[PDB]
């Protein structure tokens, strides 16, 4: 493969052996904001592998719950992401 070279902050998605809320990866750091099943909104962050990253960083636009994911690719860059919920839709669909 291609070796991990990137260091990201993590919160919620930390590996189980994470040291001081950081993680390493050959992919991208991310931050994500979303409503859970109760409409509670939460902010979590971490590392994404290189393989599959096009799909996850782009997201699908209309999932069951509102979310927004953002990715960046420089050391600890996800401490600066401030992603925001998509505007809400009115009317059935």
């Amino acid at each position: 493969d291609t070796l991990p070279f990137l260091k990201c902050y993590c919160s919620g998605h930390c590996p189980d052996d994470a040291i001081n809320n950081t993680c390493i990866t050959n992919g991208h750091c991310f931050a994500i904001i979303e409503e859970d099943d109760q409409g509670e909104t939460t902010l979590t962050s971490g590392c994404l592998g290189l393989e599959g990253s096009d799909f996850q960083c782009r997201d699908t636009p209309i999932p069951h719950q509102r979310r927004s994911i953002e990715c960046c690719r420089t050391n600890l860059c996800n401490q600066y992401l401030q992603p925001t919920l998509p505007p809400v839709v009115i009317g059935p669909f």
Partner: protein, 104 residues
């Protein structure tokens, strides 16, 4: 509401049957995999593209299941046992022990 990880599990042979067909050991640490595969699958979950795609589809169509938390690396242990002729035999057993887990 806790993610895919490996979890401890000791399998005691006497305690499940094979007390008397397996001379050695009496048990072994097997571990097992369990936990959520959320969107996004993080790096340490070693997901395949298929699983990443499936997670996104499940988020838009809930009739399609999420990925499952399963062993992604297993190792062997050898055992001493008596067989169908009943000779005492040493044998390597493949994929006995969970070394790590991922969302597949």
């Amino acid at each position: 509401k806790s993610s895919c990880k490996r979890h401890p599990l000791y399998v005691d042979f006497s305690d499940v049957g094979w007390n008397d067909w397996i001379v050695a050991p009496p048990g072994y640490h097997a571990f097992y995999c369990h936990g959520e595969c959320p969107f996004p699958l993080a790096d340490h979950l070693n997901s395949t593209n298929h699983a990443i795609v499936q997670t996104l589809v499940n988020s838009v169509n809930s009739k399609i299941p999420k990925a499952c938390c399963v062993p992604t690396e297993l190792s062997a242990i050898s055992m001493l046992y008596l067989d169908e002729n009943e000779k005492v035999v040493l044998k390597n057993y493949q994929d006995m022990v969970v070394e790590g887990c991922g969302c597949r």
